[PDB]
Design a protein around this ligand. Structure first.
Ligand code: CA
Ligand code: CA
Length: 226
């Protein structure tokens, strides 16, 4: 059963290849997750030089199996139920009055390590918009991630609105639409409607000269009562 894989601290690896308006880049991340506490700690490095988009815009793309599901909601945890074989996670992310990301990721175990491998494609960005113009603050807001079953794909459909602070005090909306499908043919938990409540803190390693992001995140499932 997939839930038993997450009772302790699990090492995480993230690998992303991206192309945003023809700017090609790669990101590698390492850290660990402790789903008992809904906790993630990770450090990401841009391995190709300078990241051509703001780090915050990649947070959602860069492992919802580490969410804390309350005991009374554990029959609604799709993400862990798909493990260890994993799931495909696909998104379209529409940046208001700007371009979009489309992403396809596979999240699964490689031995004891939870791996997220992603291909990201961004098109229609404005050269001097908030994304390619690097006008977004280095911080991150707290969100609600809404989950429902998608029975005909044997998976889930997920929607939410990310709010990225702009350096002028305004907000850059990033509308997220997501689909997750299991990779194995084994049974998964197709959940009742509920949501995940997220919080993330971004920081820098004062000794790191590469372009990077340190992330501490807590996520708790909610919306189904005792
Ligand atoms: Ca700036
Ligand atoms: Ca039900």
């Amino acid at each position: 059963k997939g839930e038993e894989l997450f009772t302790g601290v699990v090492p995480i690896l993230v690998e992303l290849d991206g192309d945003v308006n023809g700017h090609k880049f790669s990101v590698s991340g390492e850290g660990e997750g402790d789903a008992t506490y809904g906790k993630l700690t990770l450090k990401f490095i841009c391995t190709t030089g300078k990241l051509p988009v703001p780090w915050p815009t990649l947070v959602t793309t860069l492992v919802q199996c580490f969410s804390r599901y309350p005991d009374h909601m554990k029959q609604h945890d799709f993400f862990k139920s798909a493990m260890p074989e994993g799931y495909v996670q696909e998104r379209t992310i529409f940046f208001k009055d700007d371009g979009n990301y489309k992403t396809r990721a596979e999240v699964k175990f490689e031995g004891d390590t939870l791996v997220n491998r992603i291909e990201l494609k961004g098109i229609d960005f404005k050269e001097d918009g908030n994304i390619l113009g690097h006008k977004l603050e280095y911080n991150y807001n707290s969100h609600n991630v809404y989950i429902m079953a998608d029975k005909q794909k044997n998976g889930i459909k997920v929607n939410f609105k990310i709010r990225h602070n702009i350096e002028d005090g305004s907000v850059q909306l990033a509308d997220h639409y997501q689909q997750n499908t299991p990779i194995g043919d084994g049974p998964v938990l197709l959940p009742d409607n509920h949501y995940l409540s997220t919080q993330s803190a971004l920081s820098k390693d004062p000794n790191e000269k590469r372009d990077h992001m340190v992330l501490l995140e807590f996520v708790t499932a909610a919306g189904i009562t005792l």
